[PDB]
Amino acid sequence: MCDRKAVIKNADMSEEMQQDSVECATQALEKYNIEKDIAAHIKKEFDKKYNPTWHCIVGRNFGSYVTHETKHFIYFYLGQVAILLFKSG
Amino acid sequence: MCDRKAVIKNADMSEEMQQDSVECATQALEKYNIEKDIAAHIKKEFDKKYNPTWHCIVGRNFGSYVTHETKHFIYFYLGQVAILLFKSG
Amino acid sequence: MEDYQAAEETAFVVDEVSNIVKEAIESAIGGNAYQHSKVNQWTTNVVEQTLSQLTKLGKPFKYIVTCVIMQKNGAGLHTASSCFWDSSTDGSCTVRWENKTMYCIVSAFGLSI
Amino acid sequence: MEDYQAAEETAFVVDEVSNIVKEAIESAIGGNAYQHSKVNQWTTNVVEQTLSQLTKLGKPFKYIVTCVIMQKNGAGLHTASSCFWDSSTDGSCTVRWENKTMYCIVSAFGLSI
Amino acid sequence: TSDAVTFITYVQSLKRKIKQFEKQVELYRNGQRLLEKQRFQFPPSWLYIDNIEGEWGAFNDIMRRKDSAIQQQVANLQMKIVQEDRAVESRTTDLLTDWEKTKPVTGNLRPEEALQALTIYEGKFGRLKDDREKCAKAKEALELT
Known part of the structure; x- marks a missing residue:
């Protein structure tokens, strides 16, 4: 298992939800290959667990300011795969 | 004026304010060189105009899966800049 | 000592309710989130x-249990219950x-038989 | 005929309550709008x-009154109450x-004393 | 629910049209393709294809998710209509008995007071006929019962 480390850039949220994000979204990355489909995983899954409405973005080089509910913002790098995920609903 | 033709790749929105998105993103791109700040300006302008709350991203190589408010979703291109703006939350 | 034990047996203890x-x-x-279709359930x-x-419990009183389930969307929550019974x-x-x-x-009321 | 009148007099008339x-x-x-400071009053x-x-009314009923007030924001509301007494x-x-x-x-409960 | 099942009938009438519109979009999504490889300068108010195709796909998905679902839960509506038309038949029998009793065919009755009594009867009989025809039309529109 390649330790693609959840090196963290921006976050106001629980470490537990941080790192749950980390495994399952890494799971997203592992079976699939496509950024939008990885997003489909990650956003659908936290609409399952941490409830809607989540919003996820998978890429490498972007600028995103959004509004997120308190303790609901994760934004970090998994390899060059930049992963942004915030709740808003 | 650099004629950056816009092709909107997805929308649930009214056409007038879709062209408002086009024009506002044109002005933001002409004003700022930081993609973060492009998103900043477009998102603030829309929150001011049609009442919060939106989320905007600008990038090049990106996918994203989102749940949005009806008539409150747009995703277009200006030049080489993919631009997304939805309302949820 | 026996009288106090009998009274406690026949008294409506708030803590256990x-x-x-x-x-x-x-x-x-438990930890389940809110869904509109299973509120009844x-x-x-x-x-x-x-x-x-x-x-x-076997504790000799008539019971009334009311449950109000409300969603966190900014909805204000107020439940008021003033009644008339024998307070003792x-x-x-x-x-x-x-x-x-x-x-x-959930509001629970126990009244003397 | 007198027994029926007395029974009605001691009956919990749901319509009257x-x-x-x-x-x-x-x-x-009345018809006033929502004010969170006014919900208590x-x-x-x-x-x-x-x-x-x-x-x-004068009926030998201990009365329990509960009120729930919630401002319309699209929130589906259910109040459920299942209880135990002598239903007669x-x-x-x-x-x-x-x-x-x-x-x-508003839930009103009358229990025979 | 009559009105509801009306729209339910309505939505069936749309289904074919959906397919129709769908294939139009198909032909459309072909022609507009030529549009870009015929070097068209797309106007700003001109809405773009992927926008509408995405929202239309979402349209079909939401319709077939919720309208279908609300269509299977019709058994409660079925029994509601059933008991409604039993009540209609009961009231029809009551009106039959009332007509047999009320026959003013005798001439000793003062003609216009019996006329107004027959007018009250005809008003309630018209209401009964309206109820019967409404129940029958709701039954045939729902068409599951």
């Missing part, structure tokens, strides 16, 4: 478990429970 | 008026009222 209601909410709701389970435990033997307990997305207030 | 509840709600609330006034008119004597009545921006659910 509140614990029963909390256990009922935990078993029927958790309300039924909460009230049923509460009344079942209360009648398993009849009692009540309001248990207010929260998760990340829901209010649940 | 519902009428008292709706009159109390209308007197306390509105609930207290509804409950105290319901208690006063239930006591003015005691009764309950749930009155739900709503206007453009309000829901108010």
